[PDB]
A paper describes a structure:
Like the TET proteins, T7H is also a Fe2+ and α-KG dependent dioxygenase. Here we report the crystal structures of N. crassa T7H (NcT7H) in apo form, in α-KG-bound form and in complexes with α-KG and T, 5hmU or 5fU. Similar to other α-KG dependent dioxygenases, NcT7H adopts a variation of double-stranded β-helix (DSBH) fold as the core. The active site of NcT7H is located at the front end (opposite to the back end) of the DSBH core and partially covered by the α10 helix at the C-terminus.
Crystallization of a C-terminal truncated NcT7H (residues 1–299, NcT7HΔC) alone yielded the apo-form crystals. The Crystal structure of the apo NcT7HΔC was solved by the SAD method at 2.3 Å resolution. The asymmetric unit contains one NcT7HΔC molecule, which is well defined except four surface exposed regions (residues 95–116, residues 198–207, residues 278–282, and residues 296–299). There is a metal ion bound at the active site, which is provisionally interpreted as calcium as the ICP-AES (inductively coupled plasma atomic emission spectroscopy) analysis revealed that calcium is the most abundant metal in the protein solution and the structure refinement yielded a reasonable B-factor. Since no divalent metal ion was added in the purification and the crystallization solution, the bound Ca2+ is presumably co-purified with the enzyme. In the apo NcT7HΔC structure, the Ca2+ is coordinated by three strictly conserved residues His214, Asp216 and His271, which constitute the characteristic HXD/E…H motif of α-KG dependent dioxygenases, and three water molecules in an octahedral geometry. The binding and coordination geometry of the Ca2+ and Ni2+ may resemble these of the Fe2+ to some extent. Indeed, our crystallization experiments show that co-crystallization of NcT7HΔC with α-KG and the substrates yielded only the α-KG-bound form (data not shown). In addition, our biochemical data show that NcT7HΔC could not catalyse the oxidation reaction of T, 5hmU or 5fU. The structural and biochemical data together indicate that the C-terminal region of NcT7H is essential for the substrate binding and catalysis.
Numbering used by the authors: -1 to 94, 117 to 197, 208 to 277, 283 to 295
């Protein structure tokens, strides 16, 4: 743990809030302190919140606006960049309640991203999304480094595996307008979640009930997946969680799935 007040504290579930700039910019003592706090969170709750990440608030907001413009496209323009292969994991997915658009790295042979035609206010969609993908990738690399530093192994231990950039950026939109059997653990190393003000995410407590992951402004939610638990011989938890309709208006979220 560190100086900040928990993001979630309920029913024995404690999800910490950590100032990530203290890992990136602090001296060796402060860096280690923050890294261990990050590891501690993944070892107990399997979830943490980060603040003061290098991804700036104004860029996040622009990216959310850009996502909104994409989803306002007519249906056929979105189907024209439709999802293809499971190995691809790229493109638009229509409902079948909610819709999504998935972007991967630009240089995977035989699996290019299906980019929409850019006219009017969609001009800059591609450059914006590739930017955000790269910044999410850098953040993924740094979070794995915090885990390594926290464990007391070499900071760069995970770099080779995350440097391939084998990640998916997923834009989600729930048009206006409770779920069960959406309960799951993620498959990959870590997942970054940028949630809008309305929330919807719930994480299981050690006792066994689902607590709301209350949205906090300019914060990113990070959780470990099964692959990280595996790498750690189950010292790090891949915690069960689910998304739920909150207690009416349209909802947006952005997630970055690392090594899915
Ligand atoms: Ca999940």
């Amino acid at each position: 743990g560190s100086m900040e007040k928990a993001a979630v504290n309920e029913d024995g579930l404690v999800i910490p809030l950590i100032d990530f700039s203290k890992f990136l910019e602090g001296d060796e003592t402060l860096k280690l302190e923050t890294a261990k706090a990050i590891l501690h969170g993944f070892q107990t709750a399997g979830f943490i919140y980060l603040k003061n990440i290098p991804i700036q608030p104004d860029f996040r907001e622009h990216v959310f606006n850009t996502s909104a413009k994409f989803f306002k496209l007519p249906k056929e323009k979105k189907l024209e960049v439709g999802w293809t292969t499971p190995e691809a994991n790229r493109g638009y997915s229509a409902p079948g309640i909610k819709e999504s658009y998935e972007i991967g790295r630009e240089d995977e042979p035989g699996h290019p991203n299906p980019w929409p035609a850019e006219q009017d206010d969609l001009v800059g969609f591609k450059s914006t999304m590739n930017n955000f993908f790269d910044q999410c990738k850098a953040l993924h690399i740094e979070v794995m480094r915090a885990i390594a530093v926290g464990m007391g192994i070499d900071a760069n231990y995970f770099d080779s595996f995350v440097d391939v950039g084998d990640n998916i950026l997923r834009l989600l939109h729930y048009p206006a307008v409770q779920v069960r059997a959406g309960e799951h653990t993620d498959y990959g190393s870590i997942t970054l979640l940028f949630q809008d003000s309305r929330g919807g995410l719930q994480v299981k407590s050690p006792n066994g009930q689902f607590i709301d992951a209350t949205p906090i402004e300019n914060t990113v939610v990070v959780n470990a997946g099964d692959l990280l638990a595996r790498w750690s011989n189950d010292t790090i938890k891949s915690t069960v969680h689910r998304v739920v309709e909150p207690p009416h208006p349209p909802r947006y979220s952005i997630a970055y799935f690392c090594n899915p």
